[PDB]
Subunit: 808 residues, 2 copies
């Protein structure tokens, strides 16, 4: 019975010991806190001492929620063993990092006005902790550590972690958002590792999936990780957070949900939460519905270590333990560093206005550096002369940054050959030995061989011809989104599944090998994404940043769901180049079109992307033909320019028999930003008979062309704007001049009056081309608060009303 | 040996769910792949009996997850109810469950046969969600609760309408949007004498976005019923029943954000009952590509919610877990998650052969008999029903299938906002009417005193004007709900709606004193002010839902900076701006978006006026950027008293809060009304001559003060500055009447701080020359140049650009 009380007691400490650990350096919560010499083979006093030291000191360990027994066993074996005391050299090294952090903070708060919001005072221990992460990654012989973080302590991280000189850091608010790169050299090791920091907006947590994509991109380049020869995942994501942001931002859960996915895994992220137990003026009880700000990470069974920021030794030990766990199980580790925010939220803030108790406690708190220096003499680890030299190291570090900053102040063809089209065509039939194709998929493969040799190439095959030819030319092609392998409209079939074994076959991957048998250097990476927009779009944006030579495409189920990724569109994709000098070549594929499927299956919001656009930020397009889409993708991947491309892609037009292209359009043409009717360019049509000109974009062209053909209207011409942004001013002016007898011009669109290209075109076209578009009138749906009507019947009436008005 | 028993007990309680027979498809083969049994162990029970209890409780058709819960009493409550030998259900209860499976399959057969293009909405393989939901609602009625509000995606929605909400087929199939509309009904107990209201909220196609909307809605109903957090009783008598899909629950961030609200004082609803229809597929995507955890529900561990994984082919276990979930919610006022393991009989889209992408799963599904047929056959095998009883169950199925076919066949064969001085003075005095022994922080004491001074002597600033508007509404009996990030104090240390005791930390809400009339009687009003969690998506969704749940409430959500509201885009796009036109669902929610170019960067400058103006259509939203405190006071009072349910978008100030020119007089609150268009006081009250004006500057917001200062400095009598206070709907008549008073105007300019592709110019530059061609033909723009970001990252560039605007305007 007494031996059973010991077993229950062991479980109690392992399971719930963290609830009694002395982790809070402020001690704000008061309520928080025989057979002893008999052997059970160790004495009961020694088993309890091991359990109190492991689970109830300055580290709160949460690991019994992990479903993997080997992971639980790994943690308790390393957590319960009696650890060797750190060497005086390691203790002095930790202290020097705390001297540099505090010196940098004192300088930053004294020299400049308006920097209290960015202060790391009360949280300087994050610097020796981050240093231990990076030194441990270098010890494992890893290649790079990429950091993502908020503004708090950023300039401190650049100096004391990234190793950027003060002349670069204080040269000429944007410094808090820019990316950086450096080299970390081991102090007591002979290894080095690249350390980089990614750019981010003020939007807390939005960079989380961006970092993951950047890291995965770098991993695939180094041939490490998921799409690599080795399982080292030699590029480590180090992600910093705030306690209020980590608990309340949905992107955190979405990014955690990507951690073990074949398309998004980076072999585990090291998470550091700077838990200062405050969110601006908000208390944790108003910021989260759980004990810990880190409880979201339990979602993927990640071990969590709550650690007292006033103990830099435990902080550095947990950092190294986190790296080793990540290396052993290729899974996320979360370090909850409990600490405090010495200063207020904004400038001129008296934080005792909203938190009087916390700030009366903080006013009695001596610094982490002073506390650690005093604890070293108390423990007899350092002498008085050594403590004096440490104070002189702090003073010299304080003088150095003041002195250095003082000195700084005083101072292309996209056409492919027939053989290329035929090769991609044949690849759809070059099935592995014994592969069983599903009977409904077999005619698609055969039709693609027929299309490649005989023409009448549809949208779905043209996309694969564009990507296939890029892979054949040595390019890495990454394509992903919801159900992207098959296609939402059962049109892609980039991955085909064996009817009998379930084995996947990727026909385009055969073009990664030249006809002679040698590799091209190209690769096709095609994945079904998780049911996320924010994290998935963020990941793909980050991927194009991490590998600028990659063709990176993200596909929306319907364009209507990309508003769930608005923060990435607004904060990264559309503005990152102008704000940070950070470039991305990410493609967003947005299925768009009025077909009567409702307000959430109709629009990718063209008007919003056109509004976000400014000269040289993005390319926005709605191609009407498969070949033009093929040339758009090939130009985007080969132009040597890093700029996002936004494409409004079809749904019903995928299977429209008029929306097919000839071999000559792929082999002897280029992307055409403005398209005329084939009857004028190739046929016997007379442009001089035209008195009414209809300017349009997308699938409605086919309907307008069908009505023109039906009524035999020689007086009407339909001109297509294929590239919406930048406006193809030169081509649009020279095209329209070919119709001299035009007396009226109309912009025709399916979208309501306040949506589509009209709100920007109606204003821009008469300004950019006043001799051509003065008196431009609109034919569209009436302005609506939704992208369309909920009724198929209303849709059909409205669609006919547009065609009747155009030919009225 | 006794220690091996204790470790074994923990193993079953902690990990037993990994070996439970929960998957009705049995897709994972590897899942399932000494003498001491008769010896008694310490209560003293035999090892064989300890293990039989464990296997039955943790390894049968219910996988229980609860040892992650930090509360020992909650862990004790679950194991005491799960580890006891349960009474076998009565033949009447078993027949009742079967009639609910009969009802559900008849509806599915009818819907798939009668109409084309309904396979994507099919519940076939998941029919057991109906007897499960029925058991939730019957259990809530058993507790004597007032309402169950459901939020769900499209799968099984019409079925839910018919057999849960109880809507007649004539209403469900009328002129066959029905998959998105709200509904309300009454549930009457079969074997009880209670009744309960059952409602279903409207929702977009955007999976999981309705999740915080439901919470808001339910909280509002709870506050009306004086139950829960803001009530006399802790019954939380309005239960949220939230339905989900396995792929959407694991991948949508809003799920975590809505779970994070579960125990917050400003957002708690007393626990939600979550039902996940886990058909182990997401369109064509396998769970291993949809999530990084063993279960789709693993996000719910974040708040320490018990999780029950249950085999959907066992409707008895499904109904038992539903009632256990309601009892847990009632006992601990926390979330319960039911992971109903099932399958998707048909494909994703119409004409989909799901064996194309999932051949194995669908070869298994092709051998699966229905949940109804499986339950009828198991009851025969268990001797619970006779052959005649099974035949009568087949007759009941045929009868319900005929009934819906027959009923659908028959269906086919057919204002002043001005307050008195005393009202301003009362709100002013309330800031000094401190509780006995309350200690005011020294920096907060002059704010309270200035508000008493402002109320009596004038020079009223923006922050006090807002509190005067909300204070007077509370005094008139209105419920006022105000929230957002650091909203109690205000991001710009300007509000102080809640003041904190310097010595005890106790909160004091001065405006709450206005809920009591001077005689001592209640007004019926209340001030509910909260600091939100660091969420935009969930918080905006919550406030939208709150205004839907209580249309007579003044509901305001405040952004830290307007620049962060894009994190709530799905709510703006799918509910606020479009809910009325799409579902006939109305909301009077106010969004306060701090906006203005001050050099604080591209994430501290714009609430994106151009995006809200683009979303706008006649009668959907009111969009405003007031320039004076009194005009903001009248905007809020008109919004709350106009008797119209329409969202209001307000672009609020940052530096203009403390601008001494941006102050108002008592008479502006006492003898005025909201002005959509504002002229310069020199023309309305001064000795200015409107006839001297040849150049007219049309503008909105804080830049007015800079333009007015430049005019006063250069003594420019030839320039007038007209303000558009209400951006949407355009104040066409007031704008036309005002411009008509300046007859010698030869040039007109729209002046704005925002880049040319942003602000009000993209819509105004197009609309104004069309709506008023005699006034705005030849309208020119003065603004920042078009940008890919809301502004520059440099304060220096900002300052040069701002001066360039003022120099151009007076050049
Ligand atoms: C997405 C987003 N929402 C709101 C803000 C505004 N904001 C800036 S600091 C802050 C509180 C930060 O809390 P926390 O995460 O605990 O970090 P800390 O400042 O304490 O290090 C907020 C809400 C923001 N920058 N981003
Ligand atoms: C937010 C959002 N993103 C994408 C979609 C498109 N979509 C429709 S159904 C589906 C897969 C649904 O998976 P699941 O949650 O498991 O539900 P199920 O259809 O299996 O019941 C998706 C991605 C959507 N409706 N909402
Ligand atoms: Ca490019
Ligand atoms: Ca109203
Ligand atoms: Mg914090
Ligand atoms: Mg599913």
């Amino acid at each position: 019975d007494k031996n059973a009380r010991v077993i229950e007691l062991i479980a109690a400490y392992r399971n719930r010991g963290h609830l009694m650990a002395d982790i809070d350096p402020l001690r704000l919560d008061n309520t928080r806190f025989w057979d002893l010499d008999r052997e059970f083979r160790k004495k009961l006093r020694d088993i309890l001492s091991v359990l109190r030291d492991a689970y109830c000191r300055h580290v709160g360990v949460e690991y019994t929620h992990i479903l993997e027994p080997e992971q639980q066993r790994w943690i308790q074996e390393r957590v319960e063993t009696k650890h060797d005391k750190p060497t005086v050299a390691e203790q002095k090294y930790i202290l020097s990092k705390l001297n540099a952090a505090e010196a940098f903070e004192t300088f930053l708060q004294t020299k400049y006005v308006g920097q209290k919001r960015f202060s790391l005072e009360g949280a300087e221990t994050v610097i020796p902790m981050m240093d231990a992460v990076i030194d441990q990654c270098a010890e494992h012989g890893l290649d790079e550590v990429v950091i993502a973080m908020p503004h708090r302590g950023r300039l401190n991280v650049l100096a004391n972690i990234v190793g950027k000189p003060y002349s670069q850091i204080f040269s000429e608010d944007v410094k808090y958002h820019l990316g950086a790169t450096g080299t970390y050299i081991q102090m007591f090791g002979d290894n080095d590792i690249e350390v980089s920091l990614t750019a981010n907006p003020s939007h807390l947590e939005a960079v989380d999936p961006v970092l993951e994509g950047l890291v995965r991109a770098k991993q695939d380049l180094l041939d490490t990780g998921e799409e690599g020869s080795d399982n080292r995942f030699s590029v480590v994501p180090l992600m910093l957070h705030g306690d209020a942001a980590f608990a309340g931002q949905g992107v955190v859960a979405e990014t955690l949900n990507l951690a073990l996915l074949r398309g998004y895994r980076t072999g585990g992220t090291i998470h550091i939460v700077v838990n200062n137990q405050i969110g601006f003026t908000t208390a944790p009880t108003d910021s989260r519905s759980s004990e810990y700000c880190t409880d979201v990470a339990k979602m993927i069974g990640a071990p969590i270590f709550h650690v007292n920021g006033d103990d830099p030794e435990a902080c550095a030990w947990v950092a190294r333990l986190a790296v080793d766990f990540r290396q052993a199980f290729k899974k996320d580790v979360v370090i909850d560093m409990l600490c405090y925010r010495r200063r207020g939220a904004n400038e001129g803030d008296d934080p005792s206005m909203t938190q009087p108790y916390m700030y009366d406690v903080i006013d009695t708190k001596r610094g982490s550096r002073k506390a650690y220096t005093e604890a070293l003499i108390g423990r007899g680890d350092i002498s008085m002369k050594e403590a004096e030299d440490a104070l002189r190291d702090y003073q010299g570090q304080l003088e150095r940054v003041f002195n250095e900053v003082r000195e700084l102040e005083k101072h292309l063809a996209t056409a492919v050959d027939k053989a290329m089209l035929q090769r991609i065509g044949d690849a759809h039939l070059a099935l592995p030995e014994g592969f069983t194709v599903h009977p409904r998929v077999r005619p698609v493969l055969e039709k693609r061989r027929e299309m490649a040799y005989e023409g009448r190439i549809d949208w779905a095959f043209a996309e694969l011809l564009a990507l296939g030819s890029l892979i054949a030319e040595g390019k890495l092609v990454r394509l992903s989104g919801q159900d992207t392998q098959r296609g939402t409209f059962t049109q892609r079939h980039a991955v085909i599944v064996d009817r009998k074994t379930g084995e996947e076959f990727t026909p385009l991957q055969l073009l990664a090998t030249n006809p002679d048998g040698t590799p091209t250097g190209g690769k096709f990476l095609v994945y079904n994404s998780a049911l996320s927009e924010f994290a998935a779009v963020g990941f793909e944006y980050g991927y194009s940043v991490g590998n600028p030579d990659a063709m990176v495409l993200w596909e929306a189920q319907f364009g209507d769901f990309v508003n769930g990724a608005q923060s990435i569109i607004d904060e990264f994709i559309s503005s990152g180049e102008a704000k940070w000098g950070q470039l991305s070549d990410v493609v967003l594929l947005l299925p768009h079109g009025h077909e009567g499927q409702g307000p959430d299956h109709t629009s990718g919001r063209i008007e919003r992307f056109l509004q976000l656009w400014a000269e040289g930020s993005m390319t926005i397009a709605m191609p009407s033909t498969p070949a033009n889409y093929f040339h758009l993708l090939r130009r985007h991947g080969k132009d040597g320019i890093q700029r996002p491309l936004i494409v409004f892609t079809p749904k019903s037009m995928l299977r429209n028999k008029a929306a097919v292209s000839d071999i000559r359009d792929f082999t002897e043409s280029k992307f055409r930003s403005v398209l005329e009717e084939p009857m004028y360019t190739d046929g016997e049509g007379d442009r001089n008979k035209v008195t009414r000109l209809l300017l349009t974009s997308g699938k409605i062209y086919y309907e307008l062309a069908a009505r023109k053909a039906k009524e035999n209207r020689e007086d009407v011409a339909i001109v297509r704007i294929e590239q919406l942004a930048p406006l193809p001013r030169r081509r649009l002016a020279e095209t329209l001049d070919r119709y001299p007898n035009v007396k009226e011009k109309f912009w025709v669109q399916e979208e309501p009056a306040n949506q589509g290209a009209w709100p920007s075109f109606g204003l821009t076209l008469p300004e950019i081309l006043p001799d051509h578009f003065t008196g431009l009138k609109r034919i569209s749906r009436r302005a609506m608060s939704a992208p369309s009507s909920g009724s198929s019947k209303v849709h059909a009436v409205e669609q006919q009303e547009i065609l009747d008005t155009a030919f009225g």
